[PDB]
Amino acid sequence: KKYLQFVAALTDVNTPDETKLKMMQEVSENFENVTSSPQYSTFLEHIIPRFLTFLQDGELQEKPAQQLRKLVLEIIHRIPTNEHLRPHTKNVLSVMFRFLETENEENVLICLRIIIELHKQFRPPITQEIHHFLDFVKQIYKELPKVVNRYFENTHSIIPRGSLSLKVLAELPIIVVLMYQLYKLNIHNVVAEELYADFIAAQIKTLSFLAYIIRIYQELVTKYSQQMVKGMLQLLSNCPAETAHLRKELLIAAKHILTTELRNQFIPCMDKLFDESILIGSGYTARETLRPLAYSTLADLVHHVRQHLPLSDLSLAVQLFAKNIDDESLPSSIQTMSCKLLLNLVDCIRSKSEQESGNGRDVLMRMLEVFVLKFHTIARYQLSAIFKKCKPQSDKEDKQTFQVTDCRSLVKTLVCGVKTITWGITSCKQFIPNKQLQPKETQIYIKLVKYAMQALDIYQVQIAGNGQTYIRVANCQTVRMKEEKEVLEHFAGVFTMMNPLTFKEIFQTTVPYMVERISKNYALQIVANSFLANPTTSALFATILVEYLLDRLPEMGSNVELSNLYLKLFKLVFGSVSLFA
Amino acid sequence: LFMMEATLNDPQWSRMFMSFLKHKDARPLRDVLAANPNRFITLLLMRLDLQFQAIKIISIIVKNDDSWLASQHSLVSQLRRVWVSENFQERHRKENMAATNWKEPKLLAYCLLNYCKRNYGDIELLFQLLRAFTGRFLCNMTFLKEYMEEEIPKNYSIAQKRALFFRFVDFNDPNFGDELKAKVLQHILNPAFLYSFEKGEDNPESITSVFITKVLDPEKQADMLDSLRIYLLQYATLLVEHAPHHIHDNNKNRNSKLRRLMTFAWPCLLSKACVDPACKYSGHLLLAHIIAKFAIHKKIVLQVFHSLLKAHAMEARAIVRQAMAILTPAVPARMEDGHQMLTHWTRKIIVEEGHTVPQLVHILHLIVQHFKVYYPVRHHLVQHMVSAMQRLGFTPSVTIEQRRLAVDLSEVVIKWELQRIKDIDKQHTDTVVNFLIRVACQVNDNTNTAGSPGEVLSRRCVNLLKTALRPDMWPKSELKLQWFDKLLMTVEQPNQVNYGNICTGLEVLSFLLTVLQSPAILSSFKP
For this PDB entry, the determination method is cryo-EM
Q: Which residue type does A269 have?
A: C
Q: Are B106 and B138 in contact (CB under 8 A)?
A: yes
Q: For chain A, what is the largest distance between any 2 Cα atoms, rounded to a whole number of angstroms?
A: 112
Note whether B97 contacts A243, CB cutoff 8 Å: no
Query: Which among A24, A77, A371 is the top mutation candidate for probing chain B, defined by the most B β-carbons within 10 Å of its own β-carbon?
Result: A77
DSSP-assigned letter for residue B492: G
Q: Considering only the beta carbons, identify the residue of B138, B275, B356 that sits closest to A243.
A: B275
> Cα-Cα-Cα-Cα dihedral of B365, B366, B370, B372, to 10°?
20
Cα separation, B277 vs B312, whole angstroms: 9
Cα separation, B299 vs B301, whole angstroms: 5
Residue A57's alpha-carbon distances to A12, A13, A160, B160, in angstroms, are: 10, 10, 28, 72
State the CB neighbour count (10 A cutoff) for residue B254: 10
Q: Following DSSP, what letter does each residue of A179-225 receive, concatenated?
A: HHHHHHHHHT------HHHHHHHHHHHHHHHHHHGGGGGSS------
Note whether B141 contacts A328, CB cutoff 8 Å: yes
Note whether B182 contacts A373, CB cutoff 8 Å: no
Length of chain A: 581
Cα separation, A399 vs A402, whole angstroms: 5
DSSP-assigned letter for residue A425: H
Q: Are A291 and A282 in contact (CB under 8 A)?
A: yes
Q: Considering only the beta carbons, identify the residue of B314, B355, B356 that sits closest to A245.
A: B314
Comparing C-alpha atoms, which of A130, A164, A168, A152 is closest to residue A202? A152
Note whether B98 contacts A73, CB cutoff 8 Å: no
Residue A374's alpha-carbon distances to A331, A349, A391, B107, in angstroms, are: 14, 21, 27, 17
Note whether B354 contacts A77, CB cutoff 8 Å: yes
Comparing C-alpha atoms, which of A116, A50, A42 is closest to residue A77? A116
Residue A319 touches partner B, C-beta closer than 8 Å: yes
Residue B354's alpha-carbon distances to A21, A111, B162, in angstroms, are: 16, 14, 54
Query: Which among A285, A372, A378 is the top mutation candidate for probing chain B, defined by the most B β-carbons within 10 Å of its own β-carbon?
Result: A285
Tell me if residue A471 falls in helix, strand or coil: strand
Q: Following DSSP, what letter does each residue of B191-231 receive, concatenated?
A: HHHHHHHHTT---HHHHHHHHHHT-SSGGG--TT-SSHHHH
Comparing C-alpha atoms, which of A495, A499, A515, A497 is closest to residue A572? A515
Partners of residue A28 in chain B, C-beta under 8 Å: 351
Residue B315 touches partner A, C-beta closer than 8 Å: yes
Minimum Cα–Cα distance from B347: chain A residue: A32
Q: Are B294 and B333 in contact (CB under 8 A)?
A: no
Residue A515's alpha-carbon distances to A62, A183, A381, A449, B359, in angstroms, are: 82, 68, 23, 13, 58
Comparing C-alpha atoms, which of A386, A562, A384 is closest to residue A462? A386
Return the H-helix or E-strand segment holding B181. Answer: none
Return the H-helix or E-strand segment holding A416. Answer: helix A396-425
Return the H-helix or E-strand segment holding B137. Answer: none
Q: Which spans in A426-559 are helix H?
A: 439-455, 485-496, 500-520, 525-533, 538-549
Cα separation, B218 vs B238, whole angstroms: 19
Comparing C-alpha atoms, which of A227, A189, A181, A187 is closest to residue A205? A189
Q: Are B76 and B124 in contact (CB under 8 A)?
A: yes
Cα separation, B69 vs A550, whole angstroms: 45
State the CB neighbour count (10 A cutoff) for residue B158: 9
Total H helices, total E strands in chain A: 24, 2
Total H helices, total E strands in chain B: 32, 0
Residue A182's alpha-carbon distances to A21, A187, B124, in angstroms, are: 41, 9, 61
Residue B359 touches partner A, C-beta closer than 8 Å: no
Q: Which residue type does A457 have?
A: D
Burial of A60 (0-12, 13-18, 19+ CB in 10 A): exposed
Q: Considering only the beta carbons, identify the residue of A242, A323, A373 that sits closest to B275.
A: A242
Name beta bridge partners: A462: A470
Residue B120 touches partner A, C-beta closer than 8 Å: no
Dihedral of alpha carbons A81, A87, A90, A95, sign: negative
Burial of B1 (0-12, 13-18, 19+ CB in 10 A): exposed
Q: Considering only the beta carbons, identify the residue of B15, B315, B356 that sits closest to A245.
A: B315
Q: Following DSSP, what letter does each residue of B138-164 receive, concatenated?
A: SS-HHHHHHIIIIIHHHHSSTTTHHHH
Residue A249 touches partner B, C-beta closer than 8 Å: no
Partners of residue A77 in chain B, C-beta under 8 Å: 354-356
Q: Which residue type does A179 have?
A: M
Q: For Cα atoms A95, A98, A99, give the angle at the middle one, nearest 5 degrees.
A: 120
Minimum Cα–Cα distance from A249: chain B residue: B314
Q: Are A332 and B110 in contact (CB under 8 A)?
A: no
Return the H-helix or E-strand segment holding A469. Answer: strand A469-471
State the CB neighbour count (10 A cutoff) for residue A380: 13
Tell me if residue B449 falls in helix, strand or coil: coil
Note whether B98 contacts A315, CB cutoff 8 Å: yes
Partners of residue B278 in chain A, C-beta under 8 Å: 244, 286-287
Interface of B with A in 137-166 (CB under 8 A): 137-139, 141-142
Tell me the shortest Cα–Cα distance from A238 to chain B, in angstroms: 17
Give the resolution value in Å: 9.4
Cα separation, B512 vs B527, whole angstroms: 14
Tell me the shortest Cα–Cα distance from A367 to chain B, in angstroms: 9
Residue B144's alpha-carbon distances to B102, B137, B139, in angstroms, are: 18, 11, 10
Cα separation, B475 vs B525, whole angstroms: 16
Partners of residue B139 in chain A, C-beta under 8 Å: 326, 373, 377
- Please list, in sequence order, all residues whose beta carbon lies within 8 angstroms of the beta carbon of residue A61, skipping any fewer than 6 positions away: A105
Comparing C-alpha atoms, which of A350, A490, A522 is closest to residue A415? A490
Q: How many CB pairs under 8 A join A and B?
A: 66
Q: Following DSSP, what letter does each residue of A99-155 receive, concatenated?
A: S-SSS--THHHHHHHHHHHHGGG--GGGHHHHHHHHHHHHHHHHHHHHHHHH-----
Interface of A with B in 391-420 (CB under 8 A): none
